[PDB]
A paper describes a structure:
The three Rnd proteins, Rnd1, Rnd2, and Rnd3 (also known as RhoE) are a subfamily of the Rho GTPase family with atypical properties (Foster et al., 1996; Riou et al., 2010). They are constitutively GTP-bound because they have amino acid substitutions in key residues involved in GTP hydrolysis, and have a very low affinity for GDP. 14-3-3 proteins are regulatory molecules that bind many functionally diverse proteins, usually by interacting with Ser/Thr phosphorylated residues. Here we demonstrate they are inhibited by 14-3-3 proteins, which use a novel hybrid III/IV 14-3-3 mode to simultaneously engage the C-terminal farnesyl group and the adjacent phosphorylated serine residues.
To establish the structural basis for the requirement of both a farnesyl and phosphorylation modification for the 14-3-3:Rnd3 complex formation, we determined the 2.3 Å crystal structure of a Rnd3 farnesylated phosphorylated C-terminal peptide (spanning residues 232 to 241) bound to 14-3-3ζ. Although the entire 15-carbon farnesyl moiety is not resolved in the structure, continuous electron density for the first two 5-carbon isoprenyl units (labeled as Pr1 and Pr2) is clearly evident extending from the Cys241 thiol and makes contacts to a hydrophobic patch within 14-3-3 (Pro165, Ile166, Leu216, Ile217, Leu220, and Leu172). The crystal structure shows how farnesylation extends the length of the Rnd3 C terminus able to interact with 14-3-3, despite Rnd3 lacking a consensus 14-3-3-binding motif flanking pSer240 at the C terminus. This extension adds a significant hydrophobic surface to the interaction by engaging a complementary groove on 14-3-3 bearing hydrophobic residues. Other Rnd3 peptide contacts, more typical of high-affinity phosphodependent 14-3-3-binding motifs, include electrostatic interactions centered on pSer240 of Rnd3 and a basic cluster (Lys49, Arg56, and Arg127) on 14-3-3. Another important feature is the multiple hydrogen bonds made by main-chain atoms from Rnd3 with 14-3-3 side chains (Asn173, Asn224, and Glu180), serving to orient the backbone of the Rnd3 C terminus. The farnesyl moiety contributes significant additional hydrophobic contacts, effectively switching Rnd3 from having a truncated 14-3-3-binding motif lacking a proper consensus to a high-affinity site. In fact, Rnd3 does not fit either a canonical phospho-Ser/Thr-dependent mode I- or mode II-binding motif for 14-3-3, as it lacks an Arg residue N-terminal to and a Pro residue C-terminal to pSer240. We therefore conclude that Rnd proteins possess a hybrid III/IV 14-3-3-binding motif where the presence of the farnesyl group on the C-terminal Cys241 permits the engagement of the “mode IV” hydrophobic patch on 14-3-3 but retains elements of a consensus resembling the mode III motif. The farnesylated and phosphorylated peptide had an ∼15-fold higher affinity for 14-3-3ζ compared to a phosphorylated, but not farnesylated, peptide.
Author numbering:
A (entry chain A): 1 to 69, 73 to 231
B (entry chain B): 2 to 230
C (entry chain R), D (entry chain Q): 341 to 347
Write the structure that this text describes.
Amino acid sequence: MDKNELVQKAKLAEQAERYDDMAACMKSVTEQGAELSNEERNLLSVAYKNVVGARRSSWRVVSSIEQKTEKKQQMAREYREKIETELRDICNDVLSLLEKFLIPNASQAESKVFYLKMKGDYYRYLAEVAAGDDKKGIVDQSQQAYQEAFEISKKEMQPTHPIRLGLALNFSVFYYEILNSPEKACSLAKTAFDEAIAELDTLSEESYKDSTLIMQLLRDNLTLWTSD
Amino acid sequence: DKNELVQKAKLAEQAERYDDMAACMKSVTEQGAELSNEERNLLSVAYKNVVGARRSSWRVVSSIEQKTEGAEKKQQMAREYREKIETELRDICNDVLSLLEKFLIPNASQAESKVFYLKMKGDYYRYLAEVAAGDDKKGIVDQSQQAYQEAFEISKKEMQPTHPIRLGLALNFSVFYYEILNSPEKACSLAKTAFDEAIAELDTLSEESYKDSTLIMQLLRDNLTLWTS
Amino acid sequence: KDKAKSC
Amino acid sequence: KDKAKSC
């Protein structure tokens, strides 16, 4: 169909909580080669976040079972692998859209940071299930994506920008969960938070709720990565 | 093999991958052997989730299709999407109903199994009825009613009023009367009877089903008060 | 309507 | 440790 029709259909899918449909619609919109509007951009994000999120959730469940178990463990192992394949395909799907459309077509700094963040995210998800002579590359792919987004965001965006704050959140999570570097993870989270807090006046009546939420998520991870 | 598919179905459920779970239990059922209570419940839970999802989505989009009257292009999109969901919904239901006619119901040797699968037959025809419009609806509604009715008869005759399966049958039968047949009083009367009947004989409860029975009894009264307030 | 509870 | 929250 056409952009608007696909965008509305994707909105319907989301309402129906049918994120495969939503992701498929937004993928088709993206494949139309045109730079995505903020709305379309967010739809694509939300859709694949749910799609990958399911496999990620399932992966952890099965993974936690494969380890806590012979004939059973072999079955659980094969099932986990099955989920991983789904998980990876999804990630590679997103990452492909990012290399071919989103990142290149990103004209404004805002778009650039957003898609670079997304690239880091899904390489991070790949990293979550990476083991061996692929894990190292994957982890570095994510880091470099995050790092570039982080640089651009600091230079072109105010500390309270939802995209910048969201980047800090996920970048911090990457350092802790992927790189096993708590202090680095915490410092990044603490910095983004404190910087934003000191400048809550730059907020926008259309982004304040997004910014404030992300700030709460930042501190949450921070307290998590300290108490036990 | 049975055990392997059943174990895999337990894994699928843990991962909340109910399509996988339904597929495993479907394969188990297709092995032609009568299902154990465990296998029976796995099959039930799986498809309840599989169909439950499409039903939830259906209501959301349907509720949107109506809320966009006068908005031609919006309403047409919601309608078409709704239709798409319906097709999935029906396939799921017909899948289950087929398993019930070819394996579960016939292979049902005990009254308990008979009531359970007849209830299940009523349930999924009801789900078909939920999205039926036109010629097919009348037949569909009668399939459900007849499935329910036989199960209801058998359950009253072979099961104590506090049996989870009997109580659960009464619950869904009542819902059928209200939502499908638009017969509130009949729906309420069936629910109230099952409840009161179970209450008068709480001694027939079992140390392994009293929680299920008491919950269903609570769901019964809940529907009752809903259909009044 | 408000979908009633089923089992 | 538990899974951290993200966007």
